[PDB]
Motif scaffolding. Sequence first.
Motif: not given
Length: 281
Positions: A204, A208, A214, A233, A236, A243, A247
Motif C-alpha cells: 500500500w 501510494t 491512516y 482506503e 488512487r 486491492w 484486503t
Amino acid sequence: IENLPAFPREKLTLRLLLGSGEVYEGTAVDILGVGSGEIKVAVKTLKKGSTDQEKIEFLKEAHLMSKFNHPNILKQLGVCLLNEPQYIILELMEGGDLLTYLRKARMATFYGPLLTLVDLVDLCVDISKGCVYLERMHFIHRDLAARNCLVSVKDYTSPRIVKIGDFGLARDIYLPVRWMAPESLMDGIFTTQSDVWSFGILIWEILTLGHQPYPAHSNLDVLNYVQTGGRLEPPRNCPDDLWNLMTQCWAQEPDQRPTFHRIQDQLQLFRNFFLNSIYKS
Ligand SMILES: C[C@@H](Oc1cc(-c2cnn(C3CCNCC3)c2)cnc1N)c1c(Cl)ccc(F)c1Cl
C-alpha cells in the motif's frame, strides 16, 4: 561454528556521513574478491559510548544477517568488531530507503510520478520474493515497512532492485502501530501471518508512493479504527486485483490471510496479465 565476515579495518575507508547508529558511505578494498578493487559500501557503526544492550542488539543483528543469502535481502559484506567503533559493512544501496525513494518519485514533477504502475509492481514482487525467503528460513521480520527496505539506484531510469534491509526486530521462529496487525497490538503476538499484514501495508505504501497509512487517524486513534474493522482506503486508481490482494492480507483473522508463496503468485500473475493487456491493444 558461526563466523562473522571479519574485514580488515585499514582496508575499509569511510567518507560521507549519511544519517543516524551512524551510517557512512565508503569504499572497501577487495570484499567481492581479489581483483575486487575498492568497491563502494555502506557502514553501520555502533557508538563509542553506547548502552551495552545496544551492543547486544548490534551483534545480534550482525549475526542474524550472516545467515541470509538472497537477491532481495541486503548483503552484510564485512564487520570490524575487534576495535570500537564496531563497523557493520553493508553493500551500498544508492537509492536510500524505499520510503524516501517513493516520495521523491511522487514529488519531482506534477507532469507525474517518476515510477509507473509497472515499476511499482516489480518493487512489490521483489519484496515478496524476500519474504518467501525469510519464511523458508523460519524467520519473522516483525517490522516490514518501506522505511526498512533499500533501493539499489538513486535514479528513476536505470534497472533497480529493492531489498529488505533492516532486521533490528526480526526473530527466529523455528510506533509502529500503523503497520502492526491487530493481534500484535492487543496481545503482543507476532507471527509469519502478522508479517503478511504488514506486507499488505507495505505494498500500500508502494502503490501510494509513500503515503502515511491512516492519514485521518492519530496514533492513539489508529487501534480504535482498525478495531472498527476499518482499513486503509484504496490507493488512487489501484488495479482491482491488487486491492483484492491487500484486503486479503488484512483479514482480521490471521488464518484467512494468504501465504507469501500465494502473495508472490498473485503478484506475478497480475504482472503477466497487465503486461499482456498492453501489448494486445
Ligand atoms: C543501515 C542503513 O544502510 C544503508 C543506507 C543507505 C542510504 C543512502 N541514503 N540514505 C539516507 C540519506 C538521508 N535521507 C534518507 C536516506 C541511506 C544505503 N545503503 C545502505 N546499506 C539503512 C538505512 Cl539508513 C535505512 C533503512 C535500511 F533498511 C538500512 Cl539497512
